[PDB]
Amino acid sequence: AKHLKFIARTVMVQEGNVEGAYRTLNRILTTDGLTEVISRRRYYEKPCRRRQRESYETCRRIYNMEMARKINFLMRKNRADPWLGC
Amino acid sequence: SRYAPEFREPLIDKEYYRKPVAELTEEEKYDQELKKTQFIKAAAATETSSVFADPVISKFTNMMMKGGNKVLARSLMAQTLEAVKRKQFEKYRAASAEEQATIERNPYRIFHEALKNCEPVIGLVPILKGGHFYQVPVPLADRRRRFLAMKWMITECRENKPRRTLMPEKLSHELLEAFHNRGPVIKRKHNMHKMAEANRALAHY
Amino acid sequence: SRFSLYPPVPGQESSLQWAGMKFEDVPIAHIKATYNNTQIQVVSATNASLARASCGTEGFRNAKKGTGIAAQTAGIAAAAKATGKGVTHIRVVVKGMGPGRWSAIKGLTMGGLEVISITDNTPVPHXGCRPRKARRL
Amino acid sequence: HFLFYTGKQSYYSLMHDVYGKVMQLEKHRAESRDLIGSRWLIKEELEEMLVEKLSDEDYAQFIRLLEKLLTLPCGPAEEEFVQRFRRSVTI
Amino acid sequence: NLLKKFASKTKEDSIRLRVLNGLLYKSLTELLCTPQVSQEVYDLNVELSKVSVTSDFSACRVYWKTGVSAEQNKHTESVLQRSAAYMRHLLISQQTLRNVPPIVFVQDKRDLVLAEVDRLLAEADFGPPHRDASPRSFLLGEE
RNA sequence: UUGUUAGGACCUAAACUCAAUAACGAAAGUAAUUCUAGUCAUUUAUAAUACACGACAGCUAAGACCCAAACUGGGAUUAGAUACCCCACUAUGCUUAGCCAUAAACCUAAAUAAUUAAAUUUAACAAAACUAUUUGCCAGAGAACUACUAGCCAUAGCUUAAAACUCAAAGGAC
Ligand SMILES: [Mg+2]
Ligand SMILES: [Mg+2]
Ligand SMILES: [Mg+2]
Ligand SMILES: [Mg+2]
Ligand SMILES: [Mg+2]
Ligand SMILES: [Mg+2]
Ligand SMILES: [Mg+2]
Ligand SMILES: [Mg+2]
């Protein structure tokens, strides 16, 4: 309300591709976490539930990264059988 | 079936086998060489290379047959074609030169164009939802659309005719009356389409 | 020598002009997309109202008032009123995150208005008012 | 037989020979369709040659090794060998 | 205990199921209109016919409007199903419903049929207007 | 009433991202910014009948009041709705003074110093096991977060806490 208007959250349309501008603005507002914030802020999440949710996300992200690491660590060993017949 | 699944339907087209080799598309050319190493089903009793054999009329004959009496059903269709040819010959001779041009005296061409005029584009399949009968607009295949035209003709003549009239005389009068798009069978097609329009909203169900 | 997604900077000199208008002058299309009704208002850069529309005024009612096709009609209606008043280029500030958020912008394009930019003004409090309690269903 | 304790001395004795052939061809270094209208022997026929029960995985692995032998340069000894495991398709 | 935790190897219903079905459809439609679920899911531009929750509440079936191309539909099916487990999370986390059933994605080719009928219908010719267990037998010599 | 305002006023309430962080505090608890005051050495463990604290809800008095919201009213829903869903609104959540002293007040782990081998899965599951030291506490279940007693700003309250009588189980982990 005190800042300058049209600098924040503003994308510019290139060659009349109005849909591409909107679709990019969505990817911006989602990468920055504004989309999740607006959705969650519709109803009150109680402090105990917020902490349970954030602790679960962190442990969920750690387990998904390590499991990807194990799969990607053995991505190179998946090759044609060198010892076919034995 | 007594034919193993490896058996192939026979091809009874006289011109196809005698065509020059170069005139055949490579897809058709491939099938010929393949069929040399396959099993071929024996041809049916009603399958011949005759130039007078029409598949549409042959199908119409079987849909009239009762209890395997093919001789009678074929006789009725033969009498029908003749009854239509004789009805157009009378009209042609008793018409002016200008009118004579339009008059069609080929029974095979009146039969095909009659059936086509009675074929319905869309259909109605009756469904039951929530304890009521909601029939909904449906689209019909080329096989279902043709069957309905033939079935509606064989049923108008069988039922809605005087007691002493015969099928060759009622069917001839309907193929010609349908051929002009004014028969009762045409009304059956019109009623099917008009109901589908009414049930446009119920298509979702 | 490439296109810039970032808008022109107010108070500077730019080569971007639309119909002989600078960016600060192009009229603004304010879209309030809520979960029930999508309202649209078009104003000049001096804050003078030119067109107004919404799913309700078009004639949609209750749950239909909050559909994508309902908002599209509202945008086409606002475009026509704006086009009559003499508007060809609009800056789209879309508040709200409802179903007709995009459809309202699509209707404005179908109505003959040329969108040059899309801004977002969805209210995001920084810590604010306690939201209503969660629904139990 | 030195492969007795494997439990399939005849299957593995054959897979030992074909794997040694493959190694000599690969170390040492034309059209491979010397024979046409032929098929690989079915598992039942192979089991008869070995005189021992084989599984589907054992048959599938045996064929892959024989295919690799054909891919490589083959002297007349190899062609005669793979011939034993090729049965003329019924005509 | 992370590995232990996340391995995870081991008339009332009528009115309740007319609210969950409506709300779940309202909510899942919003989820797919943004990249929140994924960028792949956002680009598919999928539409939802309706949501049907089972009477047992074992599963939540979401009907999405299938298209013409089988390849387009086969791709959309795989992407939608892989993310269904994640979509359920987002609905519990925004507090749409406290408990949500496993989401299943079913195809809805009905929208194609309705378009076909209207095509033919416009073109149609309407026409003119203990004993055994115990050792007693063993210890007596009977056995 | 609504929408817009690069108009004005207000300074109520709460502190996005950072935070995928794991800091501070005895615990309760604490994360908008700045500044002021401020945590610190007892060898270590070991304390009540004393002292000082103690989420939320609640009580008392004077204020505040954006938003939320027991209760209450309205609307719908249903065989019934005394609920769930929708609208309005109050106690209350805030401040200033007291009071009350309750939580799954939980890391369901007393503190402290060891050791990792004692051929210890010494049940199982949690959180690998185990020695020593000091204090508190426990001795089948139900009756019983009860009765009586004493203390307390507490008066439908908290702490302390039995017996009769009944059963042959109750209970825990897989
Ligand atoms: Mg304040
Ligand atoms: Mg200081
Ligand atoms: Mg109040
Ligand atoms: Mg705990
Ligand atoms: Mg108590
Ligand atoms: Mg008591
Ligand atoms: Mg007492
Ligand atoms: Mg006792």
Side-chain angles (χ1 to χ4, degrees):
Chain A
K2 297 192 184 198
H3 291 55
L4 291 175
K5 312 186 184 278
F6 296 94
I7 308 177
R9 310 169 171 177
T10 307
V11 171
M12 291 283 290
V13 175
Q14 183 179 20
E15 301 156 14
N17 191 24
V18 182
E19 188 176 89
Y22 177 87
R23 290 186 80 84
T24 292
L25 183 51
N26 274 29
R27 186 183 163 106
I28 287 155
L29 295 165
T30 299
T31 298
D32 289 344
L34 270 67
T35 289
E36 293 77 13
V37 162
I38 288 150
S39 181
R40 289 206 173 91
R41 187 73 167 168
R42 204 175 162 192
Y43 304 115
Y44 187 79
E45 193 183 30
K46 292 175 165 213
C48 53
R49 299 282 291 172
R50 169 163 35 83
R51 296 186 300 261
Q52 290 167 43
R53 187 183 42 75
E54 290 175 341
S55 304
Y56 184 75
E57 280 161 12
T58 312
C59 301
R60 189 80 264 195
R61 209 185 302 94
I62 292 159
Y63 185 93
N64 288 345
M65 284 178 85
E66 195 74 333
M67 183 63 73
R69 208 172 65 88
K70 197 172 208 153
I71 292 157
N72 302 0
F73 173 69
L74 315 172
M75 202 63 83
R76 68 162 62 195
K77 202 59 165 179
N78 172 34
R79 61 168 61 85
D81 181 7
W83 322 117
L84 178 62
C86 284
Chain B
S1 190
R2 305 305 303 279
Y3 288 120
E6 58 181 328
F7 276 73
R8 295 289 310 273
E9 309 297 335
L11 176 50
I12 60 172
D13 194 329
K14 195 169 62 158
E15 301 111 335
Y16 172 93
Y17 291 87
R18 314 169 70 77
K19 262 178 176 179
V21 170
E23 182 167 1
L24 304 166
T25 68
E26 184 166 332
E27 169 51 30
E28 287 155 47
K29 193 190 186 187
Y30 172 63
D31 204 19
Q32 294 208 29
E33 191 60 55
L34 175 59
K35 274 169 161 150
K36 302 208 190 186
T37 69
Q38 284 180 325
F39 283 98
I40 310 300
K41 295 185 187 188
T46 59
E47 276 174 41
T48 56
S49 62
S50 180
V51 307
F52 300 120
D54 172 42
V56 186
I57 280 169
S58 178
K59 179 64 71 179
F60 195 98
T61 297
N62 296 10
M63 289 179 65
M64 290 194 302
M65 172 166 63
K66 292 174 177 174
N69 203 2
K70 186 91 80 166
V71 171
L72 179 62
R74 175 159 185 168
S75 183
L76 289 162
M77 188 67 203
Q79 286 171 52
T80 307
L81 294 162
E82 178 200 322
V84 169
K85 192 156 54 150
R86 284 196 200 284
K87 273 178 178 184
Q88 297 293 99
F89 264 73
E90 184 179 290
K91 189 212 289 178
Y92 180 92
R93 288 186 65 268
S96 66
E98 295 185 351
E99 290 170 322
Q100 274 175 4
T102 59
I103 294 164
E104 178 60 47
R105 295 183 293 172
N106 198 337
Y108 291 82
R109 180 176 180 171
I110 284 156
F111 175 85
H112 293 132
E113 297 186 5
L115 283 186
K116 277 195 183 191
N117 291 358
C118 301
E119 281 184 21
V121 301
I122 50 186
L124 294 174
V125 177
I127 312 301
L128 187 148
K129 190 157 282 190
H132 322 272
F133 278 104
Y134 296 102
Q135 62 182 20
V136 298
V138 173
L140 305 160
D142 290 347
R143 297 180 60 82
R144 184 68 185 166
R145 179 157 75 267
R146 294 180 183 277
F147 188 88
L148 282 172
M150 291 191 288
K151 179 73 180 172
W152 292 356
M153 198 81 69
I154 300 166
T155 298
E156 180 67 28
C157 305
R158 262 180 187 176
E159 299 179 353
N160 308 346
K161 73 173 184 189
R163 187 180 69 260
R164 291 185 73 163
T165 51
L166 300 159
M167 190 82 170
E169 175 52 38
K170 173 65 176 171
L171 186 54
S172 61
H173 181 249
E174 281 307 323
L175 294 171
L176 286 158
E177 186 177 3
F179 170 92
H180 290 93
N181 301 278
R182 52 160 178 271
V185 181
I186 301 299
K187 184 177 179 180
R188 199 162 174 181
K189 183 196 76 176
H190 288 338
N191 289 342
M192 179 154 278
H193 297 175
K194 283 174 282 176
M195 287 308 301
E197 188 282 326
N199 300 346
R200 62 201 171 282
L202 309 188
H204 297 254
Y205 299 96
Chain C
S1 307
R2 67 184 292 182
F3 184 77
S4 55
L5 293 195
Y6 305 106
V9 179
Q12 297 194 1
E13 298 182 355
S14 79
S15 64
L16 300 169
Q17 81 183 355
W18 302 265
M21 307 187 287
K22 297 185 173 192
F23 188 74
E24 53 262 34
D25 294 324
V26 173
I28 312 148
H30 289 285
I31 300 166
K32 188 161 191 163
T34 75
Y35 294 94
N36 291 338
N37 192 29
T38 304
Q39 306 178 39
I40 307 172
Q41 168 155 220
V42 178
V43 301
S44 58
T46 59
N47 173 37
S49 186
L50 304 178
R52 275 192 77 171
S54 63
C55 304
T57 60
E58 296 315 288
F60 295 78
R61 294 277 172 276
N62 309 327
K64 292 150 182 172
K65 196 164 45 56
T67 52
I69 190 66
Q72 186 155 294
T73 310
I76 291 161
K81 298 173 64 163
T83 293
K85 299 273 283 188
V87 176
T88 302
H89 289 96
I90 58 172
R91 288 181 290 173
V92 174
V93 183
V94 63
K95 181 184 300 201
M97 288 261 173
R101 178 184 165 87
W102 168 229
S103 296
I105 310 160
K106 198 179 184 190
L108 283 162
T109 298
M110 287 181 183
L113 292 180
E114 181 64 14
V115 179
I116 62 172
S117 57
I118 298 170
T119 309
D120 172 24
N121 199 21
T122 304
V124 170
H126 290 169
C129 296
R130 190 195 175 101
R132 73 201 309 278
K133 71 193 215 184
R135 295 166 80 248
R136 279 183 314 286
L137 290 158
Chain D
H1 194 252
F2 78 100
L3 295 178
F4 168 82
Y5 290 96
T6 64
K8 305 154 159 176
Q9 76 179 48
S10 296
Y11 170 69
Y12 287 129
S13 185
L14 184 65
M15 294 273 287
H16 187 66
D17 297 349
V18 185
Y19 182 89
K21 281 169 178 78
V22 166
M23 282 195 301
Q24 284 190 347
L25 300 179
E26 282 197 304
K27 288 166 189 163
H28 183 62
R29 175 165 183 181
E31 292 190 48
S32 305
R33 303 308 314 281
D34 183 87
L35 177 62
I36 296 170
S38 60
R39 57 169 177 83
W40 292 116
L41 76 175
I42 60 173
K43 178 157 81 82
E44 306 314 316
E45 290 170 1
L46 181 58
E47 284 174 293
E48 185 164 3
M49 296 175 79
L50 300 176
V51 192
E52 294 177 350
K53 182 180 292 181
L54 307 172
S55 73
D56 292 87
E57 294 99 330
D58 292 347
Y59 173 79
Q61 279 170 34
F62 176 61
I63 296 305
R64 293 207 308 277
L65 189 62
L66 272 183
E67 292 177 350
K68 181 166 187 182
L69 191 67
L70 289 182
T71 297
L72 297 163
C74 291
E78 316 306 347
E79 300 289 1
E80 178 179 346
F81 186 88
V82 185
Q83 186 63 58
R84 296 158 54 184
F85 304 97
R86 279 284 195 179
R87 296 297 200 279
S88 65
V89 171
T90 53
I91 299 171
Chain E
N1 189 265
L2 175 94
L3 179 63
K4 296 179 179 179
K5 178 175 177 197
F6 288 101
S8 301
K9 293 180 178 180
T10 57
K11 201 167 187 177
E12 168 50 26
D13 286 335
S14 59
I15 299 160
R16 203 205 166 189
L17 290 163
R18 91 190 173 176
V19 178
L20 299 164
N21 291 18
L23 182 53
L24 272 159
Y25 164 80
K26 213 165 179 175
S27 307
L28 294 173
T29 289
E30 278 142 35
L31 277 186
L32 304 166
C33 75
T34 59
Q36 181 171 19
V37 175
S38 180
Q39 187 63 54
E40 283 190 344
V41 175
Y42 183 45
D43 298 329
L44 294 174
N45 289 322
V46 189
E47 286 169 350
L48 294 189
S49 178
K50 70 195 175 76
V51 175
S52 187
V53 178
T54 59
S55 49
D56 182 86
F57 304 94
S58 190
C60 174
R61 303 159 296 180
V62 178
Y63 294 94
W64 59 277
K65 296 185 183 296
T66 302
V68 169
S69 179
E71 293 81 357
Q72 183 178 18
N73 310 333
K74 283 299 186 185
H75 174 66
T76 301
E77 175 168 10
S78 309
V79 174
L80 278 176
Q81 286 186 339
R82 298 152 182 173
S83 297
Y86 181 65
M87 305 204 200
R88 178 183 159 177
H89 172 76
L90 286 170
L91 294 173
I92 296 169
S93 297
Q94 71 196 262
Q95 302 184 119
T96 299
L97 287 166
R98 302 208 278 154
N99 302 4
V100 178
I103 288 171
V104 183
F105 274 98
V106 189
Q107 287 183 264
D108 180 68
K109 73 182 179 178
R110 165 167 50 86
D111 191 21
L112 309 183
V113 178
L114 180 54
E116 184 64 38
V117 173
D118 294 340
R119 181 180 181 275
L120 295 168
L121 188 148
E123 184 177 2
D125 192 5
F126 288 113
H130 294 337
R131 278 181 166 174
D132 284 8
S134 305
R136 197 179 70 269
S137 298
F138 175 98
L139 294 174
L140 286 175
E142 189 169 6
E143 294 192 1

